[PDB]
Structures are given as structure tokens and as C-alpha cells.
């Protein structure tokens, strides 16, 4: 699972999304350990998105992040997940948040870094519950388009919401 | 954060730790990518002590796996910290862990493989809030002596319920 109320003053920063509602990035664990530029290129995508984004973040503030984007050293993945107004999910594609994205029905942009993570997400995007980038080059656009993709087009929330 | 109850199995087993209570592994999202004998040289730790343990865990079953200790691919870590049961949290330090450990009052046993984690490690250890293992060398009894000191010793608690 059940999902209690948030923070109030997350709840705040949530509720000010309206009808566009929220993206949870969490629990970007492995941002701190690569390059300045990829949290900037993820960053310059969140931004470009109407949706509020609640970004689990530790180290130095990405200098293209958006004014819909909120950066907290902890955040209640769970909680949010479970929000009426969350979208989309974004995560590493670690086993346990992929588990919680199901469970509420929340469709996912997977980042992997270690197999693990590349094939929990190729799982996913099997079932059309899930899209996925980098490995591969990456560019902001490419995720980007992953994000409107899972946030505006309903089938991935279907297919999410087939697994639960 | 506030802790919202566990799922009935998983408060059944909490419950089973009688006066020992619990230990919680979470979420160890790295164990995979290292080898078969690490996760049973853990495993051989955990079995020699008289709590039960939860640990965040998707491989390969370890073989040196005790009858207190239990295996599952997603935790409500949150909720576990918060149980009035919990002695132990074992993190391998992302920022986001020792957050609720802080807000809880657990001490914790940090097993780092990242710089940012091989810090709030460092600090935790210094605050007198957690101790550290394996980097340098690892064997069983290096986690054993930690978990019994941060388990037994009121002090490491004393120590993380200033911090909160």
C-alpha cells in the first residue's frame, strides 16, 4: 504494497503538475559514478518534458536542469510511485524498483550500466512496458523520445499494467 | 519517512527473531555482479548470528545460506528500518539508504564498492553510526565481528539517534 501520503512539501511540488502530472527518476544510484556530461544530456531531457520530475540525486547539480526538475539526496520511491499523478518511472533497472513499477502500473525508461540491469529492462521492453537507452551511445534526444513515448502513448501503461 | 506496515509473511518471520530481532540486507543492488563465493562468504556471516535477516537479493540462492536469513528480489526496506525489530541495516552506503537508517535510528554495516559510497561509509564510520567491510581483503569473520559490535553494542545506535 500500500502507498501512504507524501511529504507535504513534496506533495506540493507534485500537486503543482496539474493534468501533466510527474516522472520519479530514482534511485539514479551508479549518476554519482560517470561523467558530468551524461547527468547533463539526462537533465537536458527531463527538462524539455512538461511533466514534474523528482530526480533521486546525490552529487553535483547538472547545469542544464530544468525548473520542472527537483533533485533530492532521498525520495519515497514507493510513495510516489503509488501518486495518481505519476507517468513514468526511470531507473537503473535494478530488480527491486522494477518490482514497485509493476506493482502501481508505472511504465519505465530503463539506463542500465551491468548486465543486471540491461537484462531486466530488455525483459520489460519485451512486454512493451518499458523503453530503454544508452549502452549504446545515448543522446538527450534519443531519451527524450523515450520519455514522451511511456508518458503519452497509453500501450505501455496496458502492458505495465498486464504484469500486475 | 513514516513507517507504513510489512506484508502478513514478511511481519510472520520479522515476528520469529523473538528478543534478537532483525537484521535488513538492502539493497545489495551490486551483489550480482560479483562472484558465487562473496555472496557465500556474506551468507556464512549472516548464519552465525542469532537474528534473522531480510536481504534484497535476485541470483543465484547462496549455499552457505542460514535458516535465519531469507532471500527476496524486492524489500520494503523503509517500512523494515522502521520496525520496532530492526538492530542492523547492511548498505553498500548509496546516499538514499543511510538516509532512512538515519530518520530511524538503525546502525548499519556499510560494504562499498563506489567512491560516494566508500564516503558515506567514512562519514557514518566517524560519526560513530556504522562500520565498514571487504575492500581491502574480506573474509566471514570481518563481517561477523562487524555485524556483532553494531547488532550488540548500544553505542553505534546512541551514535545514529544524535544524527536523527
Redesign the interface.
Known sequence: ??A?PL?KEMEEFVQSSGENGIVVF??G??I??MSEESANMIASALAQIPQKVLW?F??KKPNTLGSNTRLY????Q?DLLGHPKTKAFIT?G???GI??AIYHGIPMVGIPL???QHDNIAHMKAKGAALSVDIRTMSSRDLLNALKSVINDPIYKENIMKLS
Chains 1, 2 share one sequence.
Open positions: 504494497k500500500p501512504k511529504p530514482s534511485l544510484s551508479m554519482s559514478n533521486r546525490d552529487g539526496k532521498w525520495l519515497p514507493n537503473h535494478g530488480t527491486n518490482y514497485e551491468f548486465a543486471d
